[PDB]
Design a protein around this nucleic acid. Structure first.
Ligand SMILES: Nc1nc2c(ncn2[C@H]2C[C@H](O)[C@@H](COP(=O)(O)OP(=O)(O)OP(=O)(O)O)O2)c(=O)[nH]1
Ligand SMILES: [Ca+2]
Ligand SMILES: [Ca+2]
Ligand SMILES: [Ca+2]
Length: 341
DNA sequence: GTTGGATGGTAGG
DNA sequence: CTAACCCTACCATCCAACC
């Protein structure tokens, strides 16, 4: 069982460099402008030239411009990166039909029936990389291991423009050596709970009574971690199926006024319904982000599919339901559809 | 004794 | 308006309905 994982390098920015070769070699920052004020919004991603100065996904644009005034700031174009992505995902399809698309820039190929061993996987990996570079002019990073988790880790070690195998040896070693916060799915809240406990390595999780582990991090992560340490984790590559689709936008200024908010919410339903694409949902949720950035939502599930007419009506009720139960003002508003037929 | 809906927490793209 | 966009997956909790 060999899994190969591909993750595109600084994707959004790379696509702009390809689309405009004069940018290449100098700082580039791809932004989501929010409309509230001059240069408001956040960074979606930056090239490595820019990361050298502290500019990464998530920081505010005005922060980016503080520390890197002279870089090139480009509005985000989602449609463009998604067509390049789809073209790339199709190239990958010619190397294994057994493909799991994980996000707009990464995919898992199960390559067992294509290669006899790690050495061949590596070669196939080099072949994938050239293919993509030839057809799309995009560099990527490749991770190869016996499962999804470790293929992901191997890639994280190799970025950017890399390729790395973690063979059955190294898997055994990393279950002992690797800091536990480097396990995909272990973020900041969970790492704290584990270090306060004295779990620093995947291996430590077999040295602790299951219920205390489960008591702290929850059942599912516990099973996840323990499964990973027994070297039994074997969750297969599966064709992903969107479970929800939605959209949320930022308002020019904070509001509580249903009339002032309404057109924002409706924009979101329109876009949302466009992306639905023949999918009928039974569940609608209105999501609202507040002044202090806390996220609040109100929903409903119908025994039956929701039409675009119903969505407009139910969402307005739900918005009011929010305004009713939370007295904070609203800063971003949107909607999320789920539970398809 | 377990669905599952409503809501929120966590993680990561 | 004075920083914090953006989209999705999975899980936990509290709560009800079933039976
Ligand atoms: N709007 C927004 N978009 C993001 C954010 N994080 C990632 N993206 C988008 C932009 C990235 O180019 C793309 C892929 O994200 P990645 O996590 O793989 O990092 P990226 O490819 O940009 O650099 P790479 O070498 O992986 O590290 O997804 C974010 O916080 N906000
Ligand atoms: Ca990437
Ligand atoms: Ca990625
Ligand atoms: Ca981590």
């Amino acid at each position: 069982g060999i899994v190969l994982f591909v993750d595109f390098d600084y994707f959004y920015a790379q696509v702009e460099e390809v689309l405009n070769p004069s940018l290449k070699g100098k700082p580039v920052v791809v932004c989501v402008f929010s409309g509230r004020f001059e240069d408001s919004g956040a960074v979606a991603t930056a090239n490595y030239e820019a990361r050298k100065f502290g500019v990464k996904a998530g920081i505010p644009i005005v922060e980016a411009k503080k520390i890197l005034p002279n870089a090139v700031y480009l509005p985000m174009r989602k449609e463009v990166y998604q067509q390049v992505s789809s073209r790339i995902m199709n190239l990958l399809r010619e190397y294994s039909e057994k493909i799991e698309i994980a996000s707009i820039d990464e995919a898992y190929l199960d390559i067992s029936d294509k290669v006899r061993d790690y050495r061949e996987a590596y070669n196939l990996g080099l072949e994938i990389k050239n293919k993509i570079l030839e057809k799309e002019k995009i560099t990527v990073t490749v991770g190869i291991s016996k499962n999804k988790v470790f293929a992901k880790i191997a890639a994280d070690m190799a970025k950017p423009n890399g390729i790395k195998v973690i063979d059955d040896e190294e898997v055994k070693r990393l279950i002992r050596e690797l800091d536990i916060a480097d396990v995909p799915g272990i973020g900041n809240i969970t790492a704290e709970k584990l270090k306060k406990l004295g779990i620093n390595k995947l291996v430590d999780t077999l040295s602790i009574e299951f219920d205390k582990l489960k008591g702290m991090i929850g059942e599912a992560k516990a099973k996840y971690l323990i499964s990973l340490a027994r070297d039994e984790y074997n969750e297969p590559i599966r064709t992903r199926v969107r479970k929800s689709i939605g959209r949320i936008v930022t308002m020019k200024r904070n509001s509580r006024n249903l009339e002032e908010i309404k057109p924002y919410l409706f924009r979101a339903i329109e876009e949302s319904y466009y992306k639905l694409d023949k999918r009928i949902p039974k569940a609608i949720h209105v999501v609202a982000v507040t002044e202090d950035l806390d996220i609040v939502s109100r929903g409903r599930t119908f025994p039956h599919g929701i039409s675009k007419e119903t969505a407009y009506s139910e969402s307005v009720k739900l918005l009011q339901k929010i305004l009713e139960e939370d007295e904070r003002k609203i800063r971003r508003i949107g909607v999320r559809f789920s539970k398809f037929i």
